[PDB]
Amino acid sequence: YMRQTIIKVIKFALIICYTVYYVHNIKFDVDCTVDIESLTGYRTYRCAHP
Amino acid sequence: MICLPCKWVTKDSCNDSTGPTGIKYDLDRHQYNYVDAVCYENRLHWFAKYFPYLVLLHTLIFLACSNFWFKFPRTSSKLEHFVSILLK
Amino acid sequence: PAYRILKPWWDVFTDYISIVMLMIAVFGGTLQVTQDKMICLPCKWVTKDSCNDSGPTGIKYDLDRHQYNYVDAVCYENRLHWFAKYFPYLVLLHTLIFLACSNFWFKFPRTSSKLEHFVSILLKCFDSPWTTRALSEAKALFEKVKKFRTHVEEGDIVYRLYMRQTIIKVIKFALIICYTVYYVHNIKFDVDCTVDIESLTGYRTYRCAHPLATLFKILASFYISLVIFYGLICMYTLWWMLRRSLKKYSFESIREESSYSDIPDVKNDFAFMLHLIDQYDPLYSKRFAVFLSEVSENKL
Amino acid sequence: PAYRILKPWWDVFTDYISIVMLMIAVFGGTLQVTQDKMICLPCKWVTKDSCNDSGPTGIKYDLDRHQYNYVDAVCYENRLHWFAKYFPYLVLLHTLIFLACSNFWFKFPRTSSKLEHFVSILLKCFDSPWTTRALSELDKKEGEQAKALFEKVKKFRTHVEEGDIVYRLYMRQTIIKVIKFALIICYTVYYVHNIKFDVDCTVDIESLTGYRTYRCAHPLATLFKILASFYISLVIFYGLICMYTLWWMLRRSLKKYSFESIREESSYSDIPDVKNDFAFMLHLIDQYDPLYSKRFAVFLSEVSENKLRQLNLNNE
Amino acid sequence: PAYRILKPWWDVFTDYISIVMLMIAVFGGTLQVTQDKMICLPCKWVTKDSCNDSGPTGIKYDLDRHQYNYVDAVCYENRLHWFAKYFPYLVLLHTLIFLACSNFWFKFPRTSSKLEHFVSILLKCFDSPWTTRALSEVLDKKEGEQAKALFEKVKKFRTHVEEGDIVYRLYMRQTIIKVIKFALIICYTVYYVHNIKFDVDCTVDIESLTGYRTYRCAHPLATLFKILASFYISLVIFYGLICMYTLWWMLRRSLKKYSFESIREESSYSDIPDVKNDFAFMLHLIDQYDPLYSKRFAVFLSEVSENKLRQLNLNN
Amino acid sequence: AFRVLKPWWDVFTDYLSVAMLMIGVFGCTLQVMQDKIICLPKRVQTVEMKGLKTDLDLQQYSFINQMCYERALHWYAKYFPYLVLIHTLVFMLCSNFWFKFPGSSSKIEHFISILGKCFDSPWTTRALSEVSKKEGEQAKALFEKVKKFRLHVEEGDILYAMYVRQTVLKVIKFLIIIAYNSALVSKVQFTVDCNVDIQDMTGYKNFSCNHTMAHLFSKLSFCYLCFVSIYGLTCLYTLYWLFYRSLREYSFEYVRQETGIDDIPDVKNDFAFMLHMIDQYDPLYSKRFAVFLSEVSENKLKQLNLNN
Numbered sequence A: 001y002m003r004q005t006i007i008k009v010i011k012f013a014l015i016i017c018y019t020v021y022y023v024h025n026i027k028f029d030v031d032c033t034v035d036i037e038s039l040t041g042y043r044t045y046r047c048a049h050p
Numbered sequence B: 001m002i003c004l005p006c007k008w009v010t011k012d013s014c015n016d017s018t019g020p021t022g023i024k025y026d027l028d029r030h031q032y033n034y035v036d037a038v039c040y041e042n043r044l045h046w047f048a049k050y051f052p053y054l055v056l057l058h059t060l061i062f063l064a065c066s067n068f069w070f071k072f073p074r075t076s077s078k079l080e081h082f083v084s085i086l087l088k
Numbered sequence C: 001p002a003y004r005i006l007k008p009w010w011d012v013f014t015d016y017i018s019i020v021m022l023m024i025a026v027f028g029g030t031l032q033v034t035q036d037k038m039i040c041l042p043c044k045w046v047t048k049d050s051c052n053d054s055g056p057t058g059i060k061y062d063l064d065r066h067q068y069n070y071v072d073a074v075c076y077e078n079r080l081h082w083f084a085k086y087f088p089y090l091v092l093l094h095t096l097i098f099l100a101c102s103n104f105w106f107k108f109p110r111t112s113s114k115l116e117h118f119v120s121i122l123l124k125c126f127d128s129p130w131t132t133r134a135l136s137e138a139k140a141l142f143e144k145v146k147k148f149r150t151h152v153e154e155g156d157i158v159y160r161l162y163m164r165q166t167i168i169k170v171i172k173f174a175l176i177i178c179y180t181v182y183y184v185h186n187i188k189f190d191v192d193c194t195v196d197i198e199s200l201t202g203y204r205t206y207r208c209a210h211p212l213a214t215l216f217k218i219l220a221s222f223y224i225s226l227v228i229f230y231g232l233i234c235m236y237t238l239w240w241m242l243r244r245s246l247k248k249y250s251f252e253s254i255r256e257e258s259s260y261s262d263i264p265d266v267k268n269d270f271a272f273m274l275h276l277i278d279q280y281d282p283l284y285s286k287r288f289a290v291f292l293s294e295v296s297e298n299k300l
Numbered sequence D: 001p002a003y004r005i006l007k008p009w010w011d012v013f014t015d016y017i018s019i020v021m022l023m024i025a026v027f028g029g030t031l032q033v034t035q036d037k038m039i040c041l042p043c044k045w046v047t048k049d050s051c052n053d054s055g056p057t058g059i060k061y062d063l064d065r066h067q068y069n070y071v072d073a074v075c076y077e078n079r080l081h082w083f084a085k086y087f088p089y090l091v092l093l094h095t096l097i098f099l100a101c102s103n104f105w106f107k108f109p110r111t112s113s114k115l116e117h118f119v120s121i122l123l124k125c126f127d128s129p130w131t132t133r134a135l136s137e138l139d140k141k142e143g144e145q146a147k148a149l150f151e152k153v154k155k156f157r158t159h160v161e162e163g164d165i166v167y168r169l170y171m172r173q174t175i176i177k178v179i180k181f182a183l184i185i186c187y188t189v190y191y192v193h194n195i196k197f198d199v200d201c202t203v204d205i206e207s208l209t210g211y212r213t214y215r216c217a218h219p220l221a222t223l224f225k226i227l228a229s230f231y232i233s234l235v236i237f238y239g240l241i242c243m244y245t246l247w248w249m250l251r252r253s254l255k256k257y258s259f260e261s262i263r264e265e266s267s268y269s270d271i272p273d274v275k276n277d278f279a280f281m282l283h284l285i286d287q288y289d290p291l292y293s294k295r296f297a298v299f300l301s302e303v304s305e306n307k308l309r310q311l312n313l314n315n316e
Numbered sequence E: 001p002a003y004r005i006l007k008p009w010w011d012v013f014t015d016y017i018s019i020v021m022l023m024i025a026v027f028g029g030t031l032q033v034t035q036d037k038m039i040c041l042p043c044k045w046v047t048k049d050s051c052n053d054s055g056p057t058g059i060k061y062d063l064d065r066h067q068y069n070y071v072d073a074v075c076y077e078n079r080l081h082w083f084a085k086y087f088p089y090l091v092l093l094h095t096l097i098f099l100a101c102s103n104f105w106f107k108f109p110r111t112s113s114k115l116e117h118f119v120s121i122l123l124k125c126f127d128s129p130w131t132t133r134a135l136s137e138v139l140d141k142k143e144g145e146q147a148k149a150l151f152e153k154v155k156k157f158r159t160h161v162e163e164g165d166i167v168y169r170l171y172m173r174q175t176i177i178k179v180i181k182f183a184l185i186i187c188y189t190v191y192y193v194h195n196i197k198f199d200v201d202c203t204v205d206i207e208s209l210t211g212y213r214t215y216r217c218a219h220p221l222a223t224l225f226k227i228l229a230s231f232y233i234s235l236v237i238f239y240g241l242i243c244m245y246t247l248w249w250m251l252r253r254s255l256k257k258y259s260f261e262s263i264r265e266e267s268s269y270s271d272i273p274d275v276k277n278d279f280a281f282m283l284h285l286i287d288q289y290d291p292l293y294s295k296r297f298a299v300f301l302s303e304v305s306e307n308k309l310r311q312l313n314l315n316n
Numbered sequence F: 001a002f003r004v005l006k007p008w009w010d011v012f013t014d015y016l017s018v019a020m021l022m023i024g025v026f027g028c029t030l031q032v033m034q035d036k037i038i039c040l041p042k043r044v045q046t047v048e049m050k051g052l053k054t055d056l057d058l059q060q061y062s063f064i065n066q067m068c069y070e071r072a073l074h075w076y077a078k079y080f081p082y083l084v085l086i087h088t089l090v091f092m093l094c095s096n097f098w099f100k101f102p103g104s105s106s107k108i109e110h111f112i113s114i115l116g117k118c119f120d121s122p123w124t125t126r127a128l129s130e131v132s133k134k135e136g137e138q139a140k141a142l143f144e145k146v147k148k149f150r151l152h153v154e155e156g157d158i159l160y161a162m163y164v165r166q167t168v169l170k171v172i173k174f175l176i177i178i179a180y181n182s183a184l185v186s187k188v189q190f191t192v193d194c195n196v197d198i199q200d201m202t203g204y205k206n207f208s209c210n211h212t213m214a215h216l217f218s219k220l221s222f223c224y225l226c227f228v229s230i231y232g233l234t235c236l237y238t239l240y241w242l243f244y245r246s247l248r249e250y251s252f253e254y255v256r257q258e259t260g261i262d263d264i265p266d267v268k269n270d271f272a273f274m275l276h277m278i279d280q281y282d283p284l285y286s287k288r289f290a291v292f293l294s295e296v297s298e299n300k301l302k303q304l305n306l307n308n
């Protein structure tokens, strides 16, 4: 029971740290530059993530 | 990811420079789908793509940690003995 | 359930009619959610805001696909009749209220407690061995029966709630039939929409086809038929609760048939649920008579 | 459940047939919801309001996708036969009527009460050990349960012979099922050929599209024909079962059951020849298992009651 | 349910195989309902009703989306083989018929009554407290009465079931049907599994509506409907082999004659006769499941054990 | 009781198999999606750029998509979840392979019945008190039962060898799965160069495609590989524990060290194997069941019953 509690609390710490750090990268507007000009004709696109 | 190309570019960036008329990109529907798939795979952040699966993995590990002592035989035998004789 | 006997043939028949009404309501609801739409096409030629129709070659409209979707959405919102759009939700609401009216006689804790007490004592009398001996010719059970009689003859709340439920279930039937019959002719396949989106589309008037109208027609007709059945059942139910007085029950036939003639005339809520018992099967009432007569108590 | 004892082989066969037709009704309704569209292409050259049917390059119709959808909806509504559109709904309604007619036996409160009482007394006679002990030819609790059970059986026998409501109800149910089988077979056999893959529609929407006659393909028409053939086969089997059930009711008087073989086998030779509804439910018992009537018949003869009371006097 | 005892290892193996076949049938039916189609592209160069096949730029066919949909529907109806279209429905029907053959034993009312009564008395004998004492070789009044009633019920049930064999006949017929249908399924599925092709050359003569005569079509789910079919065939083979073994188990030994020499020689009760017919068949089924049930039941039918039970009852 | 004879590694492998089955089902539902691969032809005919017109219909694009899905996408990237389902089904079937055998089940049930009834025997506590009436007759009967068990189980060695066979099957299946999955996991790529010859149908011959769920299938394959690796590590530890100590020989000398009576013998074969099972479960069960093996203990208990 002790070990389960420490494992759960350290995993909570890791989860909250990485989720709070990376939660701001979910954006509606994404600028992509993927170098597919040979197949499409344009290089940079402005995508919307619904 | 609904992707629309930037008609005018300036140093790998969109330039953003009598009635109004729509911009003609001359792209097929399938070229649009190809662009959507490519930019979704490449330039969307990994967190946005794999947030629900990471959440599911974290919750499964949490449930396994909360129910490990119920399934581990060395502790489960003691627990069932305690519960049975205490209830009865 | 526990009240498998307090529900007569009209109650169970209306319950099954309510179940079939509910499933057609759910089917219509998923019908309206999933693929319900309307395909709208303008009249190209015009004569006083109409279309004239002065080998064959297709008519070009110069409309984008999104302009067509906009015309569809605007005409669906504005010029499709609200009955053709919210018929399944109205049916679902009506059936939910019908089921609530049917089960409020079960769910109210005072009436639920009274019904469970009567059901428990009736079942334990039905499985009791002494009633067979009495009919051929338990003291604590007899005292419990007397105490329950004194408890339950005080008020007639159960009969009053049943009466109120019957009145709601018949007046709601009347309103449902009136409004559904009056508005069932507004579900048309072909409609005309004049929504004034000329600044966005270029056309004023459109002819729209509602693909699920005819189904929503016949289902509604089907629904009407079911409602009629419900009402007819409820109609006779009103007769069953107006021809005879259910607050007073006479044990005359049973006390004449049985050796004991001292069974009193039961009144109030006891009389009402014993009338329900007699409607279901007279064996239970005939058997509970001998657990009430004080002469048989003296023999017990 | 407890009514499984009263259902002979025809009833359970019809129940499984009915659940199968419900499965095909649900499948047909789901497919009619999801993919019951049709693809309509205009006839480029119209001859006498018809289609002339007269390197290669594709034909240009100058029609938008939305004009095509409008043509599809209009011709699906107008020129597709009503059977091809409402076959699964009709099948569902027919199967629901079959289920209601088969289960109205168990839902009508008078007949349901009689049937439940019969099942209860038969099951408690099965559980009674004294019933087996008497047939093999004293415990206090066994004696109490026995005396209660014989008094129960006399009371039930006096109760149930009054009216043959259950037998008449079964007759009406079988008659309703067979006439509905006849009507279903007639109209479905007549109208199954109208489900066609290729149809021609003429809906007069030249004002909105520009073409008068169209040739339409119904992709679900062949699958609906297969489902209709399956439904016809299932209804034929159900109807044959109904013919056998009606012939079973009309072969011998089910309101007259003789225990002559049973009382001839047993030592008790005074089991009365019961009649009416009790005879009917006992005939159904014989259709399920003759052992139930075999072990229940000892509760009706007066000699068995005489020896029961003699053994009670010996015990008391 | 209660009939888990009567199902040997082959029966539960075929139950799992039928469940798996139903699972792949549901998967194939879902794919067929949702995304079964074909993408048909016209052949610009035609030669003897076939495609000639004589920077780069695309080929303009001048066909609308709806002309393409019409071509797809017509060449799916007319030129794609019926096996590729209706394989999920065929496997669903075959699995349903196999399950019906398996459970018709449990649903037929006469055999259902026989099996239920046999299972009930076998379960109450297996849990009878007197069996432990009898195998270990005073009696409680309730326990003694229960033991006496159980002995008499076993005797009368043996006399009741020994008269005729209807359970064995139904099992024989079900195994024969299950192997015959397996042979037919394997034959026709093996013959028609080669018609599931990814590339189909369709020629439907809709030149008046489209402008082209021959089209080449891709059936996207063909390859999947190939491998699943192969998987299905594999399962059927397993099923058939199991059924074949069961058929051999019916024929290598007489299933209507059971000898208690494995028990009456070991136990002191050597007076046990040889039961026959249906009783022998269900006892052999128990021996297939677990010989312990038959061993513990075998003491309740010999008369020496009856004598010693009556002696113990008298001693109380 | 079939839970008691299952050590921690067996429950761990069962839960890993359940997770692998869930992964396979998720992959199959991923394969349900209609839109699978998206293809565009190659070499098609403030700087302002303009789109490249391929002059293709939607049906031509769909035909190219299906042609490249059938003849250019790797078979692993299309049929990975079905292989996962098959492998996890075989893993689940072989998990209880030594459980389902008839003789194995009979001896396991006899052992657990004898051990459980010994565990609620008062005379076990009586003998533990002695070391550190009617129940005497019950203990004598249970001693004859233990002797019957010794005559019924120890003559064979089916259980240990069959368990070794099942563990070896698990180990080799893990090896094969890891091998071909590591060999073919690189085939699940996003960008695929499709080179079908449909030039007579669409006008183009070379196409560049993307598998839309290539990243998700790669993640699923890596998760399945991690699950199979954990399964293999567990089975390798099981093999090490099985072979490092001879489960045909259980030395009761550890009981002899603290308990004074030395008459209990060293069991062999199936008895020793199942006693090692119960030692992995709970060593108190074995240290308590040890006292029922001696003959001079039976003589004492016989002496006690004689005095009573």
Ligand SMILES: CCCCCCCC/C=C\CCCCCCCC(=O)OC[C@H](COP(=O)(O)OCCN)OC(=O)CCCCCCC/C=C/CCCCCCCC
Binding pocket: C025, C026, C027, C029, C030, C031, C033, C034, C035, C211, D025, D026, D028, D029, D030, D032, D033, D034, D035, D036, D037, D088, D089, D092
């Ligand atoms: C009160 C009810 C509450 C429950 C409602 C829950 C909503 C349903 C949940 C599932 C969501 C999926 C719906 C997706 C809709 C959008 C997809 C789309 O664009 O579909 C296009 C297309 C529109 O055209 P077609 O239907 O071809 O028109 C042919 C004309 N006859 O629609 C489809 O292809 C169907 C879309 C998915 C439908 C799945 C859900 C339908 C449920 C069926 C209900 C009946 C089931 C049992 C039938 C009973 C027997 C009568």
Ligand SMILES: CCCCCCCC/C=C\CCCCCCCC(=O)OC[C@H](COP(=O)(O)OCCN)OC(=O)CCCCCCC/C=C/CCCCCCCC
Binding pocket: D030, D034, E025, E026, E027, E029, E030, E033, E034, E088, E092, F025, F028, F029, F032, F033, F034, F035
């Ligand atoms: C025995 C026969 C039983 C038949 C029962 C069938 C049940 C389903 C019947 C209803 C059909 C509903 C039609 C829905 C069509 C809606 C529009 C359409 O064509 O959808 C295509 C669209 C394409 O995918 P997107 O998510 O856009 O992919 C790109 C973005 N990621 O979605 C689809 O693939 C189909 C849409 C839902 C249809 C399927 C619904 C039920 C699926 C069940 C899954 C079965 C998995 C079984 C798991 C284990 C397998 C071993």
